[PDB]
């Protein structure tokens, strides 16, 4: 109910002063107003790192000072137990001891006996701490362009990105969540550079009248400490006119990009207050764009600060989803970092659950309900893929208290009480399972009842906030899992605790071997299907559910399920649909018009099998039908889920020409965008099986012929095929699938190669007002998908033939596009990213030799994030395939030494995803000194961020995981 934490807190005043750009330091004093709880509270603990305190003071009395860092290395630096398990357990216990959720110590000021007698008299105190941040090595960021003479004034900015508990790294506090406080914030800033944090503009004139300004932001609204961040430097734009109080802060020469970017946000506010039945529960809302991003999502109190990658300036069409997608994320996680709050790390999952569900509801009534279901399919793809890679993602209410583990989910790391042990794969699937558990709450409880629940939560939050700090009656904003469950059961009490003990408290992905049997094939038994499941390693036995069957022309049959899963079950049978030449359309689904006796329609009243088409269960369903039923699903079905799962099932085995015909019929209608992308991939995989069975034409030429008429297109489609984004996505996708069309003689895509060359010839001027960039990028990706691995028979790598014959033309085109984007550049060098992927594929086919020096020169510092991340993916795969130890040493040294966090994040991420030095396959000899240097990089040099040593924990998961590394 209540927090197990003494020393309640009310007020805190920050005052940043003397912020430097040359020695790059910060000095400041912080002010805490504290009501202690119990007597003999002598060793009062706060917590921070990289903070040299100048002095501490309580009412003109400098007391004692304790400053420890057990977040650093093991207490013996040469602890020979250099394995995963001992380091994981010792680090979990050590950083739990860093956490003040016990009698612990990181910053323990000792109360003297005089002030102890004062605590015996009055438990009301004030804390004044003068301190100084150095050159910030994990707590702030000083983005400075390398000029330093004049453009350090105009062109640089100062901010703080970080994780949830990164407030420790910036200014000293408690465990930085779950301390409902109020703040006064004093900012010694430049006259041009504007400081952006929480609260309100409560005292701002040209302040202190000497040379600079000083900002007073007061946060009276009670939040936690894990919401404060200070962006200094950008320029003010009000993009108000619809709701009059939305403020934005961005760097100069980026301002009409904001004038296009911000709008449609008022619609998101309108829909969120249709959901919540309130107002926006603040004064105003702030947004800062910045050329760095620890997290792309990041959402704080009345303020969203994230990357200058999401502008999307009116011509750059393929961020039409992404921009307001990330804005919806940075409003939802905003709303649930503001008021509703966890009591512990194990109690969080409700928050990001309801936030992801709220921006999913936003994705419902803004764009693409079928794309919304496709996003749910991508969520299931992510969850099934990761929890078949690794174990489950469990949502604990249960602790390991009493030095206990209780962790079957400890295949790698600790998960119960602590954030900074987890991986971003685990964190992403935490959010993904939060999405789908909220969809299970949809599946058992009505949406209107959820609106009632959420209105009750925000009613208790807004009533408990903005008051005179009611003593002992103020922690109602801690709305964690237990009381939230009680509120749901008060609204509608059902079997939601079985839903918890299934999906919240048993982290398992469930496959489904629902074996199709065929009764009423003029049979004695009537329409029966067997249920079966067993697949251990990561399995789960889920019982009572329902099953959806569509008839030929008839009812949605729904059938119960049972536990003890060696089962046989029935169907609420259709009539005997006989004389079906007369029974043409007896109401299939409304007024849909379809006629085929082409199936096995002698004695078959069934068409399709389905288990929960609204996608309740974390599922991977495996079964078999007749192939005619699968192909008849792809002429029309009212589920994009059914369409793309039949697309996968018909990507596996078949090759008739009627499949190609029905695929081309499905691709020429108004059905869906990405269904046709994966259907062109069906055409690719099936025409790859047309080596000896080349019955049709060379495919997908007639699809460009019969669908696109500019001026009737005399054999060639050239100009101005836009303003219909169906054709935009389709022309973006299809030549990539055309480049896969291969029959095995030399795989011979020569007509397709020349056709793609002719398409690259025929680009448009400014008649298209749509910045023809991604079309070029995916055609270069089709050139990358022109993999020809079998040219170098003996030695043709090293400028022998000036290698021949079409590879040289592809080199000409990628040279042209690289130098055009060196001269033109149009939007982020995305063409250069596709070209570098093409150059790596050519290095993987032995045409351009395996040399990292181009990728080395594009992994340098002063480039864009995407260029650098593509070159780093390239050099990670280079270290995987080739035996380059020296570039791995440089890669680890740049993991140690660079100021950008996200490139380190993604180096570690896709170094874990694409590993060299593979466990129990050790030919390049990691045992020599690489185990030692990786152990050092886990211990030392990684006190900057938590996630970098989390990625290093992922590295030792991949590299020599549950054993000694076979050194000694």
């Amino acid at each position: 109910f209540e927090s197990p934490r003494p020393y309640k807190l009310t007020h805190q005043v920050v005052c940043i002063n003397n912020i430097n750009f040359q020695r790059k330091s910060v000095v400041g004093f912080v002010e805490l107003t504290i009501f202690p709880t119990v007597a003999n509270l002598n060793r009062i603990k706060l917590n921070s790192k990289q903070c040299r305190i100048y002095r501490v003071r309580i009412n003109d009395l400098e007391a004692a000072f304790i400053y420890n860092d057990p977040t650093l290395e093991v207490c013996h630096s040469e602890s020979k137990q250099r394995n995963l398990n001992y380091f994981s357990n010792a680090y979990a216990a050590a950083v739990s001891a860093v956490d003040p959720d016990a009698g612990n110590g990181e910053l323990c000021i000792k109360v003297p006996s005089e002030l102890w007698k004062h605590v015996d008299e009055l438990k009301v105190l004030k804390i004044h701490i003068n301190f100084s941040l150095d050159q910030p090595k994990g707590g702030l960021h000083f983005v400075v362009p390398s000029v330093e003479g004049s453009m350090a004034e105009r062109g640089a900015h100062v901010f703080s990105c970080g994780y949830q508990n990164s407030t420790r790294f910036w200014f000293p506090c408690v465990d930085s969540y779950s301390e409902l406080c109020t703040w006064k914030l004093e900012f010694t800033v430049d006259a041009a550079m504007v400081a952006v944090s929480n609260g309100d503009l409560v005292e701002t004139v040209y302040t202190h009248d000497m040379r600079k300004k000083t900002f007073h932001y007061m946060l009276t609204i009670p939040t936690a400490a894990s919401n404060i961040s200070l962006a200094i430097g950008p320029f003010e734009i009000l993009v108000d006119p619809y709701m009059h109080e939305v403020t934005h802060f961005c760097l100069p020469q980026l301002l009409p990009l904001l004038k296009h970017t911000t709008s449609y946000l008022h619609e998101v506010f309108e829909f969120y207050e249709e959901i919540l039945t309130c107002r926006y529960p603040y004064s105003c809302f702030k947004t800062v764009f910045i050329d760095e991003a620890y997290v792309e999502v990041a959402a704080y109190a009345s303020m969203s600060i994230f990357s200058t990658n999401l502008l999307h300036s009116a011509m750059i069409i393929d961020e039409t989803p992404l921009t307001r997608r990330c804005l919806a994320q940075s409003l939802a996680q905003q709303f649930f970092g503001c008021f509703i709050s966890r009591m512990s790390w194990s109690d969080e999952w409700v928050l990001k659950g309801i936030s992801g569900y709220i921006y999913g509801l936003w994705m419902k009534k803004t764009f693409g309900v079928n794309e919304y279901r496709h996003w749910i399919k991508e969520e299931l793809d992510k969850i099934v893929a990761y929890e078949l890679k690794t174990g489950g993602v469990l949502l604990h209410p249960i602790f390991g208290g009493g030095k206990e583990k209780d962790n079957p989910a400890s295949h790698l790391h600790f998960s119960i009480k602590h954030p900074h042990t987890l991986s971003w794969e685990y964190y992403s699937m935490f959010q993904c399972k939060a999405h789908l558990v909220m969809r299970l709450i949809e599946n058992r409880i009505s949406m209107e009842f959820m609106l009632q629940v959420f209105n009750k939560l925000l009613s208790l939050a807004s009533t408990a906030s903005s008051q005179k700090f009611q003593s002992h009656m103020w922690s109602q904003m801690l709305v964690s899992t237990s009381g939230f469950l009680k509120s749901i059961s008060n609204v509608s009490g059902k079997d939601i605790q079985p839903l918890i003990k299934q999906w919240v408290d048993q982290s398992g992905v469930v496959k489904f071997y629902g074996s199709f049997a065929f009764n009423r094939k003029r049979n004695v038994l009537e329409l029966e299907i067997k249920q079966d499941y067993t697949s251990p390693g990561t399995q789960k036995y889920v019982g009572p559910l329902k099953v959806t069957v569509q008839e030929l022309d008839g009812s949605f049959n729904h059938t119960l399920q049972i536990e003890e899963n060696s089962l046989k079950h029935d169907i609420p049978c259709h009539s005997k649909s006989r004389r079906n030449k007369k029974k043409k359309i007896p109401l299939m689904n409304g007024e849909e018009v379809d006629m085929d006796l082409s199936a096995m329609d002698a004695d078959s009243p069934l068409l399709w099998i389905r288990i929960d088409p609204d996608m309740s269960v974390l599922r991977k369903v495996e079964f078999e039908q007749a192939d005619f039923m699968w192909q008849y699903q792809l002429r029309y079905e009212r589920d994009v889920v059914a369409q793309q799962e039949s697309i996968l099932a018909l990507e596996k085995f078949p090759t008739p020409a009627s499949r190609l015909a029905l695929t081309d019929i499905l691709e020429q209608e108004q059905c869906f965008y990405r269904v046709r992308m994966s259907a062109c991939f069906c055409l690719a995989k099936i025409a790859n099986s047309m080596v000896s069975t080349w019955t049709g034409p060379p495919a997908m030429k007639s699809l460009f012929t019969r669908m696109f008429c500019c001026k009737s297109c005399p054999n060639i489609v050239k100009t101005n095929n836009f303003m219909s984004f169906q054709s935009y996505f389709l022309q973006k996708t299809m030549p990539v699938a055309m480049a896969l069309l291969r029959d095995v003689h030399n795989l011979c895509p020569k007509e397709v190669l020349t056709f793609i060359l002719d398409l690259i010839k025929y680009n448009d001027n400014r008649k298209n007002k749509f910045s023809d960039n991604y079309y070029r990028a995916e055609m270069i990706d089709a050139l990358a998908n022109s993999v020809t691995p079998a040219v170098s028979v003996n030695n043709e790598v090293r400028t022998l033939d000036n290698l021949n014959p079409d590879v040289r033309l592809i080199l000409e085109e990628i040279t042209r596009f690289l130098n055009m984007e060196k001269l033109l550049p149009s939007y982020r060098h995305t063409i250069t990213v596709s070209c570098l992927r093409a150059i790596r594929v050519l290095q993987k086919n032995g045409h351009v030799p395996s040399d990292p020096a181009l990728f080395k020169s594009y992994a340098e510092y002063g480039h864009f994030v995407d260029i650098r991340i593509a070159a780093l993916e390239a050099v990670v795969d280079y270290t995987k395939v080739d035996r380059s130890y020296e570039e791995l040493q440089w890669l680890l040294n740049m993991i140690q030494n660079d100021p950008v966090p996200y490139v380190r994040h993604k180096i570690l991420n896709m170094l874990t995803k694409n590993p060299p030095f593979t466990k129990n396959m050790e030919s390049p000899l990691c045992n020599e000194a690489l185990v030692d240097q990786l152990w050092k990089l886990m211990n030392s040099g990684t006190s900057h961020d938590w996630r970098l040593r989390c990625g290093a924990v992922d590295l030792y998961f991949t590299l020599f995981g549950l054993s000694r590394p076979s050194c000694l």
């Binding site: 362009p145 390398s146 000029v147 453009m151 062109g155 760097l251 020469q253 980026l254 990009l257 050329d291 200058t308 990658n309 502008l311 300036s313 011509m315 910045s771 000036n802 040289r808 080199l811 000409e812 040279t815 690289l818 130098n819 060196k822 550049p825 939007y827 982020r828 060098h829 181009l854 020169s857 594009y858 340098e860 510092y861 002063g862 480039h863 864009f864």
Partner: peptide
């Protein structure tokens, strides 16, 4: 020098004002 003399990397100070300019 004859066939494919690709332009080497510049890397310069401020990437976001250049690579995000219409």
């Amino acid at each position: 020098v004859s066939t494919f003399p690709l332009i080497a990397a510049r890397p310069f100070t401020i990437p976001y004002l250049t690579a995000l300019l219409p």
